[PDB]
Design a protein around this nucleic acid. Structure first.
Ligand SMILES: [Mg+2]
Ligand SMILES: [Mg+2]
Ligand SMILES: [Mg+2]
Ligand SMILES: [Mg+2]
Ligand SMILES: [Mg+2]
Ligand SMILES: [Mg+2]
Ligand SMILES: [Mg+2]
Ligand SMILES: [Mg+2]
Ligand SMILES: [Mg+2]
Ligand SMILES: [Mg+2]
Ligand SMILES: [Mg+2]
Ligand SMILES: [Mg+2]
Ligand SMILES: [Mg+2]
Ligand SMILES: [Mg+2]
Ligand SMILES: [Mg+2]
Ligand SMILES: [Mg+2]
Ligand SMILES: [Mg+2]
Ligand SMILES: [Mg+2]
Ligand SMILES: [Mg+2]
Ligand SMILES: [Mg+2]
Ligand SMILES: [Mg+2]
Ligand SMILES: [Mg+2]
Ligand SMILES: [Mg+2]
Ligand SMILES: [Mg+2]
Ligand SMILES: [Mg+2]
Ligand SMILES: [Mg+2]
Ligand SMILES: [Mg+2]
Ligand SMILES: [Mg+2]
Ligand SMILES: [Mg+2]
Ligand SMILES: [Mg+2]
Ligand SMILES: [Mg+2]
Ligand SMILES: [Mg+2]
Ligand SMILES: [Mg+2]
Ligand SMILES: [Mg+2]
Ligand SMILES: [Mg+2]
Ligand SMILES: [Mg+2]
Ligand SMILES: [Mg+2]
Ligand SMILES: [Mg+2]
Ligand SMILES: [Mg+2]
Ligand SMILES: [Mg+2]
Ligand SMILES: [Mg+2]
Ligand SMILES: [Mg+2]
Ligand SMILES: [Mg+2]
Ligand SMILES: [Mg+2]
Ligand SMILES: [Mg+2]
Ligand SMILES: [Mg+2]
Ligand SMILES: [Mg+2]
Ligand SMILES: [Mg+2]
Ligand SMILES: [Mg+2]
Ligand SMILES: [Mg+2]
Ligand SMILES: [Mg+2]
Ligand SMILES: [Mg+2]
Ligand SMILES: [Mg+2]
Lengths: 131, 31, 122, 169, 67, 200
RNA sequence: UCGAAGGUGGGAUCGGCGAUUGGGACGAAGUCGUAACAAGGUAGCCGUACCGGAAGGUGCGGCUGGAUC
RNA sequence: CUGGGCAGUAACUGACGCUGAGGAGCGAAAGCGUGGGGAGCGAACAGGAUUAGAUACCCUGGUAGUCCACGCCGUAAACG
RNA sequence: AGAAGCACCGGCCAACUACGUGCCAGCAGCCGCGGUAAUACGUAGGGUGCGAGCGUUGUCCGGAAUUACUGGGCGUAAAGAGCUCGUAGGUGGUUUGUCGCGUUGUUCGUGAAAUCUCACGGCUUAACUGUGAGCGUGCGGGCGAUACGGGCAGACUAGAGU
RNA sequence: CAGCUUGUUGGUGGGGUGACGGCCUACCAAGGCGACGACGGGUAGCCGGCCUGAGAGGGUGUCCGGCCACACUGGGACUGA
């Protein structure tokens, strides 16, 4: 069945980014909203917002592309898995593309990326690498 | 030539069954 | 595959077959060296090869190659045997070191003169 | 003053009624030694003719390799037909470390500092195809920043930040 | 079994090489100065001096009784 | 142990004039032997091996000693080739070569081996000692009035003196300003191929 | 009383040898065929059953990793 | 007599889901047991032919089997 | 002036010509060489790599991403159970509040000494030693956190079922 | 190697011990362990470490140091902290 909507969301992102889709729609969960917030303020997508779905909430996000048809995301990868959870301390955080990409980190301070985790001093769950 | 891989197995199985039929009696039933 | 599968049954390495036997962790081992004779190699490389049936001090029996040319080995020479397998012969997997108790060094050896057993000169 | 290097010379054959018709394939890599590298396959009845054809069609298959001063910007893994080549940037001291087929391509590209590892097929041609694919996958901080909309300093790590200007003063 | 109680402990720990979280249980013995306890009985315990061959625990407080 | 053999032979084999001045070299720039003129196969391992042999026989350094120096150069922070050249320069026979108190390496080495040298007034006879910063490169007091030690005076002008050591007048004592880094190191050899070698 | 050793007994279990016998592998320029690869001369294979010096043959069902219109 | 599936309404429950080591059931054909049945076909078998031979292919017959009931078997290029 | 030998030279692998032998002797790790012109056997010369060491064996790791957590695969290359149901187990939609077990932050204690790494110091340098700083990844206590996972008390209908 | 366990699981009263304790004993109940591998078979001293490896891992436990076990083989007490 439907396991790990985090990976479902990022796989929807991959498939539509590879298909050059302007926008994606999916179910809304607070974790998805915060992941889309991270993706925004790290600059991998354009605006996202929410519909009044028939049930629940519906999360739509827009995919930004360069002036020509170049992907603004070069890929992405779920790292924390429901079959294998991966945790990282603040001193041994993952380095995505040596730094040119980022990793979504879940911490007691909420969801926040590699730079905030390193210079704020707490590590924890590593949901995914976007780059 | 993937059928050759089947023919080797066929020959080995055929010889084993032939040996069992040579010994379905006290030749092998005692043992 | 499905990491739960790995935790239920872990990755187990393939059995590494013992490359050398009859010596049981011994770099060399001596033998009474019965039945010296000469045998033929496989379908190519038609020649005649000097081999010896060695009763090793592991209380085993193996076939060994006599390297070099010439040997004084007949039936009961106390030989020292080490590894090394010849490609031509099927059952040869060991080699008597030349220059041991009752294996003299090969005569007229002036090149490489440590294998095959040889003092320099007089 | 412009580097060529041939990696593999392989004698192919075509079978006809009379017998076997032989030919030579000459995989060559042409490079400037700073950032310009191209790979040419090249085929001809004669070994130097195949060398020349490979050089001539490698010099028309060029692509820029993004470096930062002897090492690549970030680590990648190129996947060829069946070749897999993994590249990891190296500290400014330890030189090129690569296998026979990869080493030529990155030396012609002009990297001085790289960790290369062939994990997939061992065929030289597919190895160089995989390495080239990895160099395509390579990206620059200054265009990743344009890709993401954020400036240089908040996309590229401070290490490579301060390591860039140490070349050009 | 006559003033003896059996508490089935719980623990989760990181798998040493595959890194998963394995759920491992226990089955251990604790004291009851009063032999009243159903089946279930989320309860807490602390160590003692051994009161039998495999007695090392004591029931301290019983909460959310067996329903 | 030392090589104790021909020098121009290996200069020819390595295809580089290692020593300073050799008429025996440049007459037959090809490697010696009966097959001295054959077209050698320009292999990567080939030039790496000739290059490491260059690095060794330039300073008269033996194999496992060069190993040990390279395994501490790799471990030292930063880079490895610059520090490897640094330390192989810091060997005191090379120090004498830079100071100009010798004509060739094989007697720069022997002037140390034969005990004509105190560093901090300490009798040293091992040629592998490494000079530190600010140190004094001095001689025994009784060495004076000896033929090479007095021809060492007028032969101090034909060879330039590096800027990491200072040589003074009637007391033939050197002062090591600092441990020389990269540039003032004479470079008959490109040095990244040692670095590449030992990853094999 | 308990108690090592010892004795008695019946089992368990791990090995060695064994007349005789069975297959396997590797060898050589041996003997009998020609079963497969082409429609391989009856398409070939799978399971199963029976038969035959030997490859194999045949029946029943199946497959195309064969054909035909 | 009986199983499943699909669509629609949104009436109901409110995560009750997925998978599944072992395990259990089902499982072509052949085969096995007992009892029936047996037209046609048809392993085996026999004759004829072909052939150097022909333990085959082709022909003539033809037993088991193929069918039924109830058990057993539990295997197939059981394949997409 | 008393003081150098060892191994190897077809490709891996750095290092070649000649003579003697002629499927013989023999070499070899691999694939192969030698049947009258051998860079591959024996000798000579030369050379290469080393050097009080050089080679052979045996053992182990590496290369081997050829047990794959890092880091592999299963249509035809080895690999989907004949199919289904279902036990343990693994795993699990959306949302609210709480616990803080996992997770995570900090401190304290422990993690002996020696070993390994950094810096100096001395045995003539070195090997070796000493000192100071890391390592000691883990664990126990206290004080924080609740984003994710987990427990609990609930809620929803989107999955599932009626 | 799928069933192992009867002083075995627990309790009471005792004994015994330096000390808790089926450590032992009388009585009473019938429990405890196990597919997260009981019971069994084979192998093995363990460790900081050492070898290798980029690491994770793999091999190994020799000098040194720490812990344990043993002292011809097997069983037992004594003194004495
Ligand atoms: Mg084909
Ligand atoms: Mg692939
Ligand atoms: Mg491969
Ligand atoms: Mg009590
Ligand atoms: Mg017998
Ligand atoms: Mg045929
Ligand atoms: Mg046939
Ligand atoms: Mg025919
Ligand atoms: Mg046929
Ligand atoms: Mg059949
Ligand atoms: Mg028949
Ligand atoms: Mg049929
Ligand atoms: Mg409701
Ligand atoms: Mg099953
Ligand atoms: Mg059934
Ligand atoms: Mg039937
Ligand atoms: Mg029947
Ligand atoms: Mg029958
Ligand atoms: Mg009947
Ligand atoms: Mg018929
Ligand atoms: Mg007939
Ligand atoms: Mg019926
Ligand atoms: Mg099957
Ligand atoms: Mg079917
Ligand atoms: Mg070579
Ligand atoms: Mg000749
Ligand atoms: Mg030779
Ligand atoms: Mg070896
Ligand atoms: Mg491995
Ligand atoms: Mg190996
Ligand atoms: Mg594979
Ligand atoms: Mg699959
Ligand atoms: Mg297959
Ligand atoms: Mg299937
Ligand atoms: Mg189902
Ligand atoms: Mg199921
Ligand atoms: Mg369940
Ligand atoms: Mg659960
Ligand atoms: Mg959930
Ligand atoms: Mg000092
Ligand atoms: Mg020191
Ligand atoms: Mg120390
Ligand atoms: Mg310590
Ligand atoms: Mg529904
Ligand atoms: Mg009792
Ligand atoms: Mg009692
Ligand atoms: Mg008492
Ligand atoms: Mg033992
Ligand atoms: Mg590795
Ligand atoms: Mg010990
Ligand atoms: Mg010892
Ligand atoms: Mg004794
Ligand atoms: Mg006492």
């Amino acid at each position: 069945t439907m396991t790990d909507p985090i990976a479902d969301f990022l796989t929807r992102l991959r498939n539509a980014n590879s298909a050059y889709h302007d926008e994606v729609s999916l179910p809304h969960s607070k974790l998805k909203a915060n992941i889309a917030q991270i993706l925004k303020n790290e600059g991998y997508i354009s605006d996202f917002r929410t519909e009044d779905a028939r049930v629940g909430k519906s999360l739509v996000i827009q995919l930004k592309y360069g002036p020509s048809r170049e992907r603004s995301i070069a890929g992405l990868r779920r790292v924390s898995k429901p079959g294998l959870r991966v945790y990282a301390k603040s001193t041994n955080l993952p380095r995505v593309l040596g730094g040119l990409g980022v990793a979504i980190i879940s911490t007691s301070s909420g969801l926040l990326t590699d730079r905030q985790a390193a210079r704020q001093g707490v590590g924890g769950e590593v949901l995914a690498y976007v780059w | 030539g993937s059928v050759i891989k089947k023919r080797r197995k066929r020959m080995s199985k055929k010889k084993h069954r032939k040996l069992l039929r040579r010994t379905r009696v006290q030749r092998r039933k005692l043992g | 595959p499905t990491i739960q599968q790995l935790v239920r049954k872990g990755r187990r390495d393939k059995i590494s077959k013992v490359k050398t036997a009859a010596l049981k962790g011994s770099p060399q081992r001596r033998g009474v060296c019965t039945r010296v004779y000469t045998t033929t190699p496989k379908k190519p490389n038609s020649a005649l090869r000097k081999v010896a049936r060695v009763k090793l001090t592991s209380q085993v029996e193996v076939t060994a190659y006599i390297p070099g040319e010439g040997h004084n080995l007949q039936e009961h020479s106390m030989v020292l045997v080490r590894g090394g397998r010849v490609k031509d012969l099927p059952g040869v997997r060991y080699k008597i070191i030349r220059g041991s108790l009752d294996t003299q060094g090969v005569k007229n050896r002036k090149q490489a003169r440590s294998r095959y057993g040889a003092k320099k000169e007089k | 003053n412009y580097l060529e290097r041939v990696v593999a010379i392989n004698r192919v054959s075509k079978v006809v009624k009379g017998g076997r018709r032989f030919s030579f394939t000459a995989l060559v890599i042409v490079g400037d030694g700073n950032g310009m590298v191209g790979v040419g396959y090249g085929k001809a009845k004669e070994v130097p003719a195949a060398i020349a054809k490979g050089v001539e069609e490698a010099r028309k298959s060029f692509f820029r390799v993004p470096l930062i001063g002897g090492t690549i910007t970030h680590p990648v893994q190129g996947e060829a037909a069946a070749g897999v080549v993994l590249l990891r940037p190296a500290s400014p001291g330890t030189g090129v470390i690569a296998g026979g087929a990869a080493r030529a391509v990155l030396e012609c590209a002009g990297v001085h500092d790289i960790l290369a590892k062939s994990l997939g097929s061992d065929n030289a041609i597919n190895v160089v195809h995989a390495t080239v694919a990895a160099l395509k996958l390579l990206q620059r901080p200054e265009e990743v920043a344009a890709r993401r909309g954020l400036p240089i300093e908040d996309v590229a790590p401070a290490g490579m930040l301060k390591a860039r200007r140490k070349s050009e003063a | 079994m006559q003033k003896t109680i059996v508490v089935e402990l719980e623990d989760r720990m990181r798998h040493p090489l595959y890194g998963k979280i394995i759920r491992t249980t226990k089955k251990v013995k604790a004291h009851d100065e009063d032999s009243v306890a159903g089946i279930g009985d989320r309860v807490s315990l602390m160590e003692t001096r051994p009161l039998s061959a495999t007695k090392r625990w004591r029931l301290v407080e019983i909460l959310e009784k067996a329903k | 142990a030392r090589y104790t053999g021909p020098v121009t032979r290996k200069s020819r084999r390595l295809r580089t004039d290692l020593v300073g001045g050799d008429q025996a070299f440049e007459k037959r720039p090809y490697p010696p032997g009966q097959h001295g003129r054959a077209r050698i196969k320009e292999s990567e391992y080939l030039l790496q091996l000739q290059e490491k042999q260059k690095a060794r026989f330039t300073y008269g350094v033996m194999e496992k000693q060069f190993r040990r120096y390279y395994e501490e150069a790799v471990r030292q922070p930063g880079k490895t080739g610059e520090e490897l050249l640094k330390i192989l320069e810091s060997r005191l026979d090379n120090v004498i070569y830079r100071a100009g108190l010798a004509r060739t390496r094989r007697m720069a080495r022997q002037l140390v081996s034969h005990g004509h040298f105190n560093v901090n007034g300490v009798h040293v006879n091992v040629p592998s000692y490494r000079v530190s910063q600010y140190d004094i490169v001095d001689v025994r007091d009784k060495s004076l009035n000896t033929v090479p030690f007095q021809i060492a005076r007028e032969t101090a002008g034909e060879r330039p003196i590096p800027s990491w050591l200072q040589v003074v007048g009637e007391r033939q004592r050197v002062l090591i300003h600092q441990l020389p880094e990269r540039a003032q190191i004479d470079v008959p050899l490109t040095e990244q191929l040692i670095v590449e070698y030992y990853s094999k």
